[PDB]
Amino acid sequence: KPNPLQDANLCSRVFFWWLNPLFKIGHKRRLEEDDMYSVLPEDRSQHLGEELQGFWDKEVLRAENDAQKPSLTRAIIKCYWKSYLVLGIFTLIEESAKVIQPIFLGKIINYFENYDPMDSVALNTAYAYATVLTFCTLILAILHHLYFYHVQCAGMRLRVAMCHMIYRKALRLSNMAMGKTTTGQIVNLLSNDVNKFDQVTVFLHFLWAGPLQAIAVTALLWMEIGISCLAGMAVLIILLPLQSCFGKLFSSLRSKTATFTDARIRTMNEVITGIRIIKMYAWEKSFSNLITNLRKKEISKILRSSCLRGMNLASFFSASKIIVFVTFTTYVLLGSVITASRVFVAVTLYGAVRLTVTLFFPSAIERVSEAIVSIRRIQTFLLLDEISQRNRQLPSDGKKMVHVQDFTAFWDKASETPTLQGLSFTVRPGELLAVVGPVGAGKSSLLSAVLGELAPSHGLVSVHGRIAYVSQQPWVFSGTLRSNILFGKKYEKERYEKVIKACALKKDLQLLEDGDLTVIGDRGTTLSGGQKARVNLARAVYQDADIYLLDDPLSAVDAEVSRHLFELCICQILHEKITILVTHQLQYLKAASQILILKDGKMVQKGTYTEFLKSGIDFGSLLKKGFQAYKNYFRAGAHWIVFIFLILLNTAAQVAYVLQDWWLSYWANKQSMLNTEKLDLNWYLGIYSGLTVATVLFGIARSLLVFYVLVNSSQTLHNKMFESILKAPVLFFDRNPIGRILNRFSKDIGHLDDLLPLTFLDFIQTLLQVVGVVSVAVAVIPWIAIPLVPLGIIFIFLRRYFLETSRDVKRLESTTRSPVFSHLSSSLQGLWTIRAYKAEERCQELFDAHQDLHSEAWFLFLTTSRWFAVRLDAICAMFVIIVAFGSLILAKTLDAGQVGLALSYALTLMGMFQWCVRQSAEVENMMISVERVIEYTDLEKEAPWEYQKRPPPAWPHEGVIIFDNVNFMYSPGGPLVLKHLTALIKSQEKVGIVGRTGAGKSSLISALFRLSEPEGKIWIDKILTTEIGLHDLRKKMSIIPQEPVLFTGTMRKNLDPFNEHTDEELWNALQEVQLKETIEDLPGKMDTELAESGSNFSVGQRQLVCLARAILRKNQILIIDEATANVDPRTDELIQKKIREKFAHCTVLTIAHRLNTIIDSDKIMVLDSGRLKEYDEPYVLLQNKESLFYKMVQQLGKAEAAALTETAKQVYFKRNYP
């Protein structure tokens, strides 16, 4: 894919003309991967990583020569000082523009001060300064973007080289170094830790330019305004520790918030995961209270953090006002007059140095601090202990064989028990060696030593021949599946086919929809254990090496294909190869001509299968061991009258912001139109400070009120969201995954709470300063409006033209990054499989590809943004040229102050308009969080919780149930699960239920609880389910789910989350379940805060807690849905005892797979495809032995079946005829 940057001239490189052909492709349609350009030859992953590795190897060699800790920063700085110093050269010619440009504004406004129509030479020099002003604005606005691309490109090159190294080392890490760390500690080295090199370079030249820019700003400020500058510079300095104090206090508040926020999100994951449970038990009032209090405590901290961010972002807005008010509060109280040229040179210089000192210098320090942290962490990673490179193959004498002698080594040196103990064996060509030994003998470290992956501690190994390693764990990575099959080797179609069809993969390749060349899903998500096992086996067959170390490869396959390959392929093709094979399976011990047996690193015996059998020693014994969004968003927070007040406060903040500068302008005008006469200093500076304090107060009020209204929008949208998802029918959770909904509560509501209010107030603030600039120009030179409406339209269309591609680039920048981390993650898993093959050469190349492709995406991300920024800055430069020249062609009308105000604002337009547009896009893609949230507030609610027509307070009293033609179905328009269901349940009746789960067992329960309103008619004690409030039905019903769910918090919550009862009944219930000792032996007997879902509890204990809950409820109807499905037999029968003793007076519905559960049945509901076909007493149903009940009973065995039938008859006669 040719890269127009490769062969584009300087003009079409500074203007990114070379990138237009891409926009004309994105405007029409969506950009896919194949449409991205290719990365320059000097940006490939290899070239960069190899240069940096050469420098870093040189530096570690030099340091070890000096015997001092080797520095990685030195390797970097040596590798990237040539490029990143010429970058600094343009940094100088750019910040010197930023600093000199004001000194040209000064000489424009100075011609305006002494304007004389006749002196056309002064006019021409004013045009000269305007032209050089445009020159500065253009080397700042047009040429800044090639420079900024190149700075971000230095950062990209550093990141890519560092990723290449990190990957190479990760490949060469030794188990001693690897097992210490975790694959995550590495993948985060690439994900979040090397991504610190994309940004360090961005401002890494403000380390010496922020200081140097500030010194030159201060020096010019001296030469203009005497000491007066020091006051503004003092406030500007304070913004450094002041912004740092904001940062520290807001980080404290953010972490204190995060505690509450993650408590809320954990409670949310629990309520969503077990939402079915909560609805059934009718507790969502409790969890509603719990999360209402959690969110009130979190919103207190969010509102405090937002108030502080409001006072911060109002201090960035008012910053220049306080900085130029302390500056001319000092400059006028010292006998010096105010002049528009000096004022607006000073305001422009303060804008420059304020951006520099509070946003570019603090950013530079922060990011180089994180970059040094990252460099040191990668340093430690790259100094970790490596494997000893394959003991250099002595040019073989044709001897394909391996001998290990008395090898003893450790997982870790500290262990007194070595992995192996003086083990010696030699394998020569053609020998079929089956390795046998109990688990834990050191299989991993065993073959690691055989591979040479385990450094010697005792013994010695001679290795001559190629090796293919299959680990017990199969391994398959992210990439072309043919990359796995060839494992990076050259393609042989015929032998490829033989390898593929040898494992009978025709079946598996039919299991693949995309055939045998499928691009494997991310990190192998498309394969199971057996599938990856077969992939590994095929890879092994492919290489045809001289050695075959297999660690129980057949554990994932059945005997059929394993025997096929073993006798036809392994014992015929691979037996000629030196096979060292582990095997748990007896079926292939038959085929081991040579067997070698070990026990816990001890040499049991070596010999043939025949000898091992003849010795009398058993194998088993040795082995066995859009615009509705914005409207509905601003409405959810405040009453539209408060939005009118918000608009008025925004406008007044901005009007006072612009009017302090207009007051300096009027001040210059009324000092010029004078003289001896002094200005009314008290009056003029009083109004000046009035406007300044009005601007600061309105900035703070605007920020605080915008944050308050939008955080209140988040709080009200969250309340509606949660009150709608508690009342959202179970269907809305079946159609959606637990993770999708909870994402809307963590990520989306974090945007609405934390970032979207801030991003949106920053957008409004920068937009209103943009409009202040535009309107000052349009109000001093009204004719400017005529150029605007082209620019506006152009801008608008440009912004339409751009955002089409730069949303398909920002999507390619992100959809191609994940492979970079995925290849690392996968290679880390099968690093032993890799290094068994000399393959650090090729897998390095696949990672080089992945990194190159993501660097193509990042190259387009870097360059489309610079294209758009070049054109936005050309818009702003046209603005500056028409306010700079358009003013001088109008100098008869305008006086000094007017031009000062207008142009000083135009110069600020530069960059501030770009931030306006960035923030507009940020809002417009963060308002998808708002749209994706308001999607939930408006959501179909299930029946009301409380109707006005209520049953008697203690209803039901008899526990009678009436089913009449009740049909149920997961969702309207879907398949039915209950079919013409009709049945009576008398008071205190015991009715078992048999059927398939979801074929009518659970659906009938859901209909009973009205999870989804069913067809037909359900009465209880002459009262219908559907016409009564959902709680008034569910609360008075008690149920035990298939899986009993515990909720984090106190045992009292799990027992009585309303605290409507006393501790006496709680302990009665806990004694009934005989967990009384289990809890009283805990520090918090009634306040025992359990682990996550009681993760320190057994399934039986959680089931017993649910039993205690049901006992406490004392409802007249009990429901059990396969509660006896995942319980131990002993506590199972104990629970049966408790249920049959306590709930005797209540009607009981039992849904069980164990038939002991139903011997007490008064009736049994047999469901065939959801139809209640047999409805009688159990033994009566057994009398018709053609009954399905009889079939299922016999399916457990005729002995137990006959015993159960006799017991059923006995209980039948015992009840009916005592």
Ligand SMILES: CC(=O)Oc1ccccc1C(=O)O
């Ligand atoms: C006013 C302005 O936009 O200054 C900036 C320039 C570049 C990036 C960010 C900012 C900012 O406002 O924080």
